[PDB]
RNA sequence: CCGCCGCGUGGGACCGCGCAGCGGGCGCGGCGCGCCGCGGCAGCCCCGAGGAGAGCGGGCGGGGGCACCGGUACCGGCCG
Protein backbone atom coordinates (compact mmCIF):
# COMPACT_ATOMS: atom_id res chain seq x y z
CA UNK A 1 0.00 0.00 0.00
CA UNK A 2 3.04 2.25 -1.05
CA UNK A 3 6.01 2.58 -2.67
CA UNK A 4 8.99 1.04 0.26
CA UNK A 5 6.80 -2.75 0.03
CA UNK A 6 7.94 -2.85 -3.17
CA UNK A 7 11.18 -2.64 -2.65
CA UNK A 8 11.38 -4.32 0.38
CA UNK A 9 9.52 -7.41 -0.98
CA UNK A 10 11.98 -7.23 -4.24
CA UNK A 11 15.02 -7.87 -1.39
CA UNK A 12 13.33 -10.52 -0.06
CA UNK A 13 13.18 -12.04 -3.03
CA UNK A 14 16.95 -11.44 -3.77
CA UNK A 15 17.96 -12.35 -0.39
CA UNK A 16 17.35 -16.08 0.04
CA UNK A 17 19.12 -17.09 -3.28
CA UNK A 18 8.05 -18.37 2.73
CA UNK A 19 8.01 -15.63 5.49
CA UNK A 20 5.58 -12.54 5.17
CA UNK A 21 5.82 -8.93 7.05
CA UNK A 22 2.71 -7.21 7.77
CA UNK A 23 3.64 -3.37 7.45
CA UNK A 24 5.70 -0.89 7.27
CA UNK A 25 6.40 1.85 9.29
CA UNK A 26 8.88 4.74 8.58
CA UNK A 27 9.93 7.55 11.70
CA UNK A 28 11.83 10.69 11.02
CA UNK A 29 15.41 11.39 13.19
CA UNK A 30 17.06 14.64 13.95
CA UNK A 31 19.36 14.05 10.88
CA UNK A 32 18.25 13.92 7.52
CA UNK A 33 18.93 10.20 8.06
CA UNK A 34 15.36 8.70 8.41
CA UNK A 35 14.47 5.39 10.16
CA UNK A 36 12.08 2.91 9.01
CA UNK A 37 9.97 -0.28 11.35
CA UNK A 38 9.60 -3.44 9.32
CA UNK A 39 6.27 -4.95 11.05
CA UNK A 40 6.62 -8.93 11.68
CA UNK A 41 3.24 -10.47 13.05
CA UNK A 42 4.22 -12.08 16.22
CA UNK A 43 4.29 -15.71 15.73
CA UNK A 44 6.57 -15.50 13.19
CA UNK A 45 9.48 -13.16 15.00
CA UNK A 46 11.13 -15.70 16.00
CA UNK A 47 11.90 -16.97 12.77
CA UNK A 48 13.04 -13.65 11.33
CA UNK A 49 15.38 -13.41 14.28
CA UNK A 50 17.47 -16.20 13.52
CA UNK A 51 19.41 -14.01 10.99
CA UNK A 52 18.12 -10.69 11.96
CA UNK A 53 21.37 -8.58 11.36
CA UNK A 54 22.63 -9.57 8.22
CA UNK A 55 18.66 -9.04 6.64
CA UNK A 56 18.69 -5.86 8.44
CA UNK A 57 22.60 -5.44 6.86
CA UNK A 58 21.53 -6.56 3.08
CA UNK A 59 18.30 -4.54 3.94
CA UNK A 60 20.45 -1.24 4.35
CA UNK A 61 23.28 -2.07 1.70
CA UNK A 62 20.25 -3.06 -1.52
CA UNK A 63 18.56 0.37 -0.14
CA UNK A 64 19.52 3.03 1.61
CA UNK A 65 18.41 6.48 3.20
CA UNK A 66 17.28 5.55 6.46
CA UNK A 67 18.00 2.33 8.67
CA UNK A 68 15.68 -0.69 8.76
CA UNK A 69 14.30 -2.16 12.13
CA UNK A 70 12.35 -5.39 12.75
CA UNK A 71 9.81 -5.35 15.26
CA UNK A 72 6.96 -7.13 16.65
CA UNK A 73 3.22 -6.16 16.36
CA UNK A 74 1.33 -6.75 19.68
CA UNK A 75 -2.16 -5.79 21.06
CA UNK A 76 -3.13 -4.16 24.04
CA UNK A 77 -6.22 -3.89 26.21
CA UNK A 78 -7.38 -1.57 28.69
CA UNK A 79 -9.23 -4.00 31.05
CA UNK A 80 -8.42 -6.08 33.98
CA UNK A 81 -11.56 -7.70 33.87
CA UNK A 82 -14.30 -7.31 31.68
CA UNK A 83 -17.94 -7.49 32.86
CA UNK A 84 -20.40 -9.21 30.45
CA UNK A 85 -22.83 -9.06 33.01
CA UNK A 86 -23.17 -12.68 33.72
CA UNK A 87 -19.84 -14.33 33.96
CA UNK A 88 -15.98 -12.59 34.99
CA UNK A 89 -13.79 -11.92 31.74
CA UNK A 90 -9.79 -11.47 33.01
CA UNK A 91 -7.25 -9.85 30.66
CA UNK A 92 -4.02 -11.75 30.12
CA UNK A 93 -1.03 -10.11 31.77
CA UNK A 94 0.99 -10.36 28.00
CA UNK A 95 -1.56 -7.80 26.75
CA UNK A 96 -0.53 -5.59 29.35
CA UNK A 97 1.29 -2.08 28.19
CA UNK A 98 4.26 -1.77 30.83
CA UNK A 99 5.14 -6.05 29.75
CA UNK A 100 4.70 -4.11 26.08
CA UNK A 101 7.00 -1.25 26.49
CA UNK A 102 9.73 -3.64 27.60
CA UNK A 103 9.07 -6.33 24.95
CA UNK A 104 9.55 -3.31 22.31
CA UNK A 105 12.70 -2.20 24.31
CA UNK A 106 13.91 -5.60 23.72
CA UNK A 107 13.10 -6.21 20.63
CA UNK A 108 14.55 -2.45 18.94
CA UNK A 109 18.20 -3.87 20.29
CA UNK A 110 17.43 -7.70 19.79
CA UNK A 111 21.44 -8.94 19.22
CA UNK A 112 22.51 -6.93 22.53
CA UNK A 113 20.61 -8.03 25.29
CA UNK A 114 19.92 -5.23 28.03
CA UNK A 115 22.04 -5.13 31.48
CA UNK A 116 20.31 -2.83 33.02
CA UNK A 117 17.30 0.09 33.87
CA UNK A 118 17.28 3.04 35.59
CA UNK A 119 14.55 5.94 35.46
CA UNK A 120 15.50 9.99 36.39
CA UNK A 121 13.60 12.39 38.17
CA UNK A 122 15.11 15.75 38.04
CA UNK A 123 14.16 18.26 40.27
CA UNK A 124 12.39 20.14 37.23
CA UNK A 125 12.55 18.27 33.98
CA UNK A 126 10.78 15.56 32.57
CA UNK A 127 11.69 12.07 34.45
CA UNK A 128 13.71 9.95 31.29
CA UNK A 129 14.46 6.25 30.93
CA UNK A 130 18.11 5.67 30.46
CA UNK A 131 19.12 1.74 29.62
CA UNK A 132 22.39 0.08 29.95
CA UNK A 133 24.44 -1.81 27.38
CA UNK A 134 27.67 -3.98 27.27
CA UNK A 135 30.61 -2.26 26.98
CA UNK A 136 31.90 -4.58 24.58
CA UNK A 137 29.86 -3.40 21.56
CA UNK A 138 30.18 -0.09 22.28
CA UNK A 139 30.84 1.67 18.72
CA UNK A 140 29.41 -1.54 17.24
CA UNK A 141 25.84 0.36 18.02
CA UNK A 142 27.17 3.71 18.80
CA UNK A 143 25.99 5.53 15.55
CA UNK A 144 22.42 3.99 16.02
CA UNK A 145 21.69 5.29 19.59
CA UNK A 146 20.03 8.74 18.47
CA UNK A 147 17.67 6.56 16.00
CA UNK A 148 16.53 4.16 18.70
CA UNK A 149 15.49 7.21 21.14
CA UNK A 150 13.46 8.31 18.04
CA UNK A 151 11.83 5.57 17.70
CA UNK A 152 11.36 4.55 21.16
CA UNK A 153 9.82 8.16 21.89
CA UNK A 154 7.32 7.38 18.27
CA UNK A 155 6.16 3.91 19.36
CA UNK A 156 6.09 4.82 23.39
CA UNK A 157 5.89 8.25 24.83
CA UNK A 158 8.43 7.85 26.97
CA UNK A 159 11.78 9.47 26.36
CA UNK A 160 14.73 7.86 26.54
CA UNK A 161 18.65 8.06 26.63
CA UNK A 162 22.17 5.30 26.30
CA UNK A 163 24.55 4.39 28.12
CA UNK A 164 27.41 1.89 28.19
CA UNK A 165 28.19 -0.08 31.28
C1' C B 1 -27.51 26.30 59.86
C1' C B 2 -27.83 22.29 63.57
C1' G B 3 -31.03 15.45 66.40
C1' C B 4 -29.07 10.51 60.05
C1' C B 5 -24.40 4.01 60.58
C1' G B 6 -30.54 4.45 55.80
C1' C B 7 -31.77 7.05 49.92
C1' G B 8 -29.66 9.32 44.86
C1' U B 9 -25.57 11.61 41.71
C1' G B 10 -20.18 12.09 40.88
C1' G B 11 -14.83 10.90 41.84
C1' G B 12 -12.57 6.37 42.37
C1' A B 13 -6.22 7.73 44.36
C1' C B 14 -6.07 4.33 49.11
C1' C B 15 -8.79 0.05 50.62
C1' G B 16 -9.96 -5.44 49.82
C1' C B 17 -12.61 -9.32 46.48
C1' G B 18 -13.76 -11.23 40.92
C1' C B 19 -12.99 -19.92 39.65
C1' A B 20 -16.38 -20.84 34.95
C1' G B 21 -12.57 -18.21 26.43
C1' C B 22 -13.83 -14.31 22.84
C1' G B 23 -16.10 -12.85 18.08
C1' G B 24 -19.60 -13.99 14.07
C1' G B 25 -23.90 -17.13 11.05
C1' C B 26 -28.42 -20.06 12.14
C1' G B 27 -32.11 -16.69 15.00
C1' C B 28 -37.27 -13.53 15.48
C1' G B 29 -37.06 -6.57 18.22
C1' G B 30 -33.56 -7.97 22.59
C1' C B 31 -31.77 -11.76 26.11
C1' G B 32 -31.57 -17.02 26.72
C1' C B 33 -31.10 -22.17 25.06
C1' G B 34 -28.80 -24.91 21.75
C1' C B 35 -26.64 -25.86 16.41
C1' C B 36 -22.54 -24.34 13.10
C1' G B 37 -15.89 -21.88 10.72
C1' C B 38 -11.65 -21.53 12.99
C1' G B 39 -12.46 -18.91 8.22
C1' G B 40 -11.70 -13.52 12.33
C1' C B 41 -8.06 -13.20 18.06
C1' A B 42 -0.79 -12.48 19.24
C1' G B 43 -6.61 -16.96 22.14
C1' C B 44 -5.85 -18.45 27.38
C1' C B 45 1.10 -18.20 33.06
C1' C B 46 3.84 -10.50 35.66
C1' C B 47 7.86 -11.68 38.59
C1' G B 48 10.54 -14.89 41.33
C1' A B 49 10.75 -10.51 47.91
C1' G B 50 18.62 -9.48 51.89
C1' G B 51 9.35 -13.41 53.19
C1' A B 52 8.54 -18.55 53.88
C1' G B 53 8.83 -23.74 52.87
C1' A B 54 11.21 -28.23 50.23
C1' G B 55 15.95 -30.15 47.96
C1' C B 56 21.57 -31.36 46.94
C1' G B 57 26.72 -30.83 48.92
C1' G B 58 30.06 -29.69 53.02
C1' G B 59 31.94 -29.95 57.31
C1' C B 60 30.05 -28.46 63.06
C1' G B 61 28.79 -29.33 67.98
C1' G B 62 29.75 -31.48 76.80
C1' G B 63 22.43 -31.61 71.51
C1' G B 64 18.91 -36.49 72.54
C1' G B 65 17.87 -42.00 73.33
C1' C B 66 19.47 -47.42 73.87
C1' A B 67 23.00 -51.15 74.89
C1' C B 68 28.05 -51.84 76.31
C1' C B 69 32.38 -50.55 79.20
C1' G B 70 37.38 -48.54 81.99
C1' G B 71 39.50 -45.86 86.16
C1' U B 72 41.09 -44.60 90.80
C1' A B 73 38.84 -43.05 95.38
C1' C B 74 35.04 -43.51 99.97
C1' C B 75 33.09 -47.82 102.70
C1' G B 76 33.10 -53.09 104.51
C1' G B 77 35.67 -58.05 104.90
C1' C B 78 39.99 -61.07 104.79
C1' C B 79 46.07 -63.06 104.62
C1' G B 80 50.59 -61.26 106.56
Not at 35 to 42: G, I, L, S
Not at 63 to 73: C, D, K, Q, W, Y
Not at 85 to 107: A, F
Amino acid sequence: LSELEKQVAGTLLKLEDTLYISSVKEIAVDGDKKAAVVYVPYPMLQSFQKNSEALILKLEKNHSGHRFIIVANRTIMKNAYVFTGKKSIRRPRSRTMTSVYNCILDDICYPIHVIGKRTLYPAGSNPRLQVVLPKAVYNEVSERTKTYSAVYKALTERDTEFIFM
